[PDB]
Symmetry: D4
Subunit: 194 residues, 8 copies
């Protein structure tokens, strides 16, 4: 494929970067593993392709790609499908590796995360650790309160996540103000536990 | 002396109404309002409270509004610091029977807590009544949309109003308390 | 007593004019203005209306301005809530013969509704007269451009002014009412 | 042509995207049809080409390309030609397919649309449906009032549209404030009907 | 005469407390506050200082606060223009024993300089006392974070408060003086 | 009666100075200021001018400031509408010998026009004197930089001040008048 | 050269654009002439090249390229050379063709222009026309006053100009506030004439 | 390498630029020397590569690349490692040549600089000159005070620097407000000396 070729060419550049900066062998291996998991040996100009489409098609694509995730989350499954679409269109796919701190306690929070596939651990001084998996979200509390992160969140497995920025969160909720309650209920219940 | 202050202030009202040649029934309506709102006594509340400190102002506003606070779970079951923050922002208002407190379709700049009285919520279908210990006008404040209904006083109504700016300021400090308002709004929108 | 309030307030004016050694003709001009503007009676209108509630303030402003409202299709044929929103924002002003109410080329911060009087619109060619039931100063408010003409009082003129900020605020609530002003502005610009 | 080649290369990437995400056959067909209608088998870097020009030439091009559309609309035909130019320069070409919801009732409106070629249906709860075609525009009401969309608008045919953002609408009308009346008159007449 | 002004102002307080039916102990608490805060004399300080010029206002605020200034290195060892800028912004406040001047976890809008009195800093562990010549409430102003502790008056306490906006304004002119506050904040956060 | 108003206002000053135990020499300094600033007469100028209309306020401010206007080409040779815009924004201030009107290195928030008096411009070298018909403090307003010099009153000095916000507002309407200030600033910076 | 090749490849794209939009023969000729004058048969990624440099080198380059223009203008020749550098760094090269309206009277003005090489005519209702040439600038008045353009300015010859945006004009003058007087003196003298 | 090739291709473009603008021989030599020092004969799309990664990996890379610099500066060595990471992620690598004015006295300051490797001279009217080298920073004072530059700073050797913008400086210190004191202490001590 032209896409397998693009991936190979891009990763060759990554190897040249890593050698230029004399990254240790095991570090280069970690980066290689990331690239394989994130891109699965194929690359295309996604922003370019999607930008060449129109609104309806982009919305149809994002709804199709996220079918299963949507159905597994009462947040979305039960919602106005236009709210679901507005949310989906703002999501950014990210992949984390085992051990990664996705969120660090006490920092400024600018994103939340929806778990497509993976296991993460929520870590608080007053433990023990609490796990979240497919169909859950986290990082909402800072977005709601503008306070610092209430816990750290560490990937236990390779985790395929979708992030939503605080600005995009606030934009969607300007259009669908009553959907704020869904996030607040989860946040309140979590704050009560910790 | 606050009786004298009232009588002096009302004499100025009378001279205004005379200058502008308001008809007798209207002047009587204004007289009745003044009696219900001020109860024959007036003082410069702003200057008085401004002479005090934060703790005393807060103690006073809590004492004055004990019934309001105990009347709604919103306040009764909340962080007392949230309650105090809200109370300090409330403005007392009296409405007369027939008054349109809120008009459907307009921009919403305030919500209202009912201390005593009965109002009718009017939508284009039967009127829905609200009374002591309820609030209304919250939906515009939450959504920034236009008023979803008219609200008309059925009886003399003693209300406390809260401006949209003050609502947002308090909820900046107490963000999770937004949920209490949203629950009421969602239930009402469904209905 | 509002007669006494007037006479006391005017005595303070007299002491100001004396301190600053204004010439006799100028002092007479100020005296005549005071008589026309206040008609021998004064009261703290702001404090009075501030003691009332929204409904009564709105009832009063509508009653006081019945003639103005009926005099122009702008108000006469509009949503009465738009009319009330506009009226609440109006400031009463009296001008004397020869007064330049608006100067060509300056920044426009207000428009004016004529309750009673005659003004001349002056462009660099014959003067165009406007009288009871007309308005002017709208073009700057619409365009943010400089004044297209001077406007000078021919007679004692009783006007209501509306600030650019208030104009924009009302039209935020009533966006389609902008068209009424634009139609007048376009016709005048063509002429 | 170098432009036919560019289109072919770009569409190959689109096929690789669609296969990667396992899009259904009929969905891939819909996307293929869109690409053919939107680009007509040719691609170039339009933003790059136009960006290499100067102001006068860009304005001459946009006026030429839109000759017929302009003449068919009393909005433009009767206007200051500098207003026409200012408007034209802000327009974004979009193509919609039969059945597409271009506008959904009740949502936040951030664009209006001018119809170059196509038929659309305006749909309100209090129907019946009203059709608009070449030389008409829609979506103006939200732009004027900042209220939510008063109706849905669905493409009945392949529709070649030019969108104008609310920011660009407001910018042009800052320069030509009296032209706001043209949009208001249409909006008022439509609000009276619905 | 300022004794007469005090007695008149306090009579208005009494009429307020009577209207709102405050209990006797509360009325006594308010009486005691008034005596400590105003010491039997009242004047319109704002109007008085507003009648003066900048130099005289600055001379007065420096003279009135000599003890405060000499009591802390922050002021004692600083650019006298910084000291004057700060002093002009301070608001005098009196608190009574038991008053929560600052509540932990709330939004911080002010800091406080102790002229005379003792307060307890309370954290969830033994109380830490602060007295004449110390300040508190600085940490929220620096960080924009919530209050790290409660601060409660142990004695009648005569404080000067400085708003967050005024704090930031002064430090815009005197940016390096931020370090003095930061040093105190860091030491306290470590503890 | 404005003599009575002065004497009443000054009695309140005396009670303030007594409460705060200002020393005799300082009280005398304040007394002398009051006499020079108000000349034994006081009235509520703000309320008085607020009772008038735009034309009369403008006529009054022009009449009161004829000498200032004729004394500087800045005003004397300018669009009279610019002159009026500036005058309406000026605040009268009196300074005493030795007063530091401007301190070098501080943030500049005002400039000053000399009606009557002598000031010294002080730079770290010989003092440069300015008198009737000159202005100073313009450089900070133009550049947003810190004050380039100190300016100290040598005699009792009757000045009009213009705030940086008001300066910028007027120059928004009259942009080419900025050049008059810049020419003075450039000449002074060179020197 | 790689630069002659890049130009040829880019212009081929321009021809494909022009044929796609069926531009008239004489219009295509005008565009061809523009490209030859503007780029002189060579193209490179200038923003990329300059972006690869540092501050000092960019400043040395801009000062060198504009040596002659600077010396011919008392505005710059007499100024703080750091002011000259700050101004030069914000300038955008543009080329106009004979007959082009560079500025139209009555419009909102967002740029001024410095003439490197060319002749333009300033046109006012109260004429006659006034010519400006190498080393002059125009369009300053709107930038100073925020008023509408006081005249039209039309290129009489091929004109090689440098534009300066109102934002960039205001930025430079924040750093060098006393240099505002130079522009004001020219503006005042011109307003007096017209 | 693909990276050596990219560098060669890019530098060929630079030569074509320099010849087009007829830059003097010694000037072209200075630019050549800069390119060799800055890029060391290799080029890749660094922003592209780093943008393809996730947060954790970018942070691991920046921490690794800057190991030695961090350890040599009590500012960082002693700090919350999350503060160090936040700072590092905002830094921009720049290379200056002997004689370059990195900062000019009296100008508006929008950046500060950390010295990775090089010697610079701080120059004040009230001299003499003061040198700073590896592990030092400069330009902090304008960032703290918003005043004009208090001195000029000139590179004595080839200097490998990391710049931090005023906006990025203020952003990091919003998250770590007490770290402002470290910069203030250095600034105060320097202002006392000059
Ligand atoms: N008890 C809990 N159970 C599950 N998740 C939690 C719990 N407490 C906190 N979290 C999550 O951890 C996140 C840390 O970042 P935030 O505080 O922004 O949002 C927090 C929640 O999403
Ligand atoms: N079904 C309902 N029952 C009670 N109150 C309502 C109902 N619907 C609307 N309201 C109230 O009427 C108010 C009208 O103004 P708001 O839309 O701001 O907020 C609305 C609610 O507070
Ligand atoms: N031909 C005209 N007839 C009546 N009034 C006019 C005419 N031209 C201008 N005006 C008014 O004069 C006003 C001067 O200020 P404005 O430009 O703000 O608004 C202008 C109009 O209201
Ligand atoms: N009666 C009507 N006839 C034609 N178009 C309409 C009518 N009513 C609404 N529309 C259009 O449908 C659009 C829906 O989005 P807007 O409300 O922004 O703008 C609306 C109008 O452009
Ligand atoms: N260990 C301490 N010793 C003295 N004062 C403290 C200590 N910890 C906190 N404080 C003060 O208590 C204040 C509570 O409000 P702030 O967090 O704004 O600022 C805090 C400090 O001024
Ligand atoms: N050489 C000079 N002659 C007269 N006045 C000066 C001179 N230098 C500075 N000033 C004035 O002193 C003022 C001090 O404050 P500013 O810098 O704002 O503006 C300055 C000028 O108005
Ligand atoms: N008399 C004149 N001589 C030369 N140039 C002029 C004259 N009048 C106007 N201009 C220029 O024409 C420009 C038109 O746009 P601006 O008004 O922004 O700025 C104007 C001046 O630069
Ligand atoms: N005495 C000094 N020793 C070392 N560096 C200095 C000294 N004085 C000034 N500098 C640096 O030179 C910089 C010039 O720009 P800034 O004023 O922004 O910040 C200044 C300091 O970082």
């Amino acid at each position: 494929d032209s896409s397998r070729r693009q991936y190979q060419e891009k990763y060759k550049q990554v190897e040249q970067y890593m050698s230029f900066h004399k990254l240790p062998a095991d570090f280069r291996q970690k980066i290689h593993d990331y690239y394989e998991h994130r891109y699965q040996g194929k690359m295309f100009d996604e922003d370019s392709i999607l930008g060449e489409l129109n609104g309806p098609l982009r919305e149809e694509i994002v709804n199709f790609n996220n079918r299963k995730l949507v159905a597994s989350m009462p947040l979305f499954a039960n919602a106005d499908p236009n709210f679901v679409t507005a949310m989906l269109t703002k999501l950014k796919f990210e992949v984390f590796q085992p051990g990664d701190y996705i969120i660090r306690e006490g920092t400024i929070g600018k994103k939340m995360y929806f778990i497509q596939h993976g296991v993460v651990s929520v870590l608080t001084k007053g433990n023990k650790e609490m796990k979240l998996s497919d169909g859950s979200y986290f990082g909402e509390i800072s977005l709601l309160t503008r306070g610092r992160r209430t816990a750290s969140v560490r990937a236990d497995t390779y985790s395929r996540l979708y992030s939503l920025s605080v600005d995009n969160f606030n934009e969607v909720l300007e259009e669908y103000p009553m959907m704020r309650r869904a996030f607040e209920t989860v946040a309140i219940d979590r704050l009560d536990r910790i």
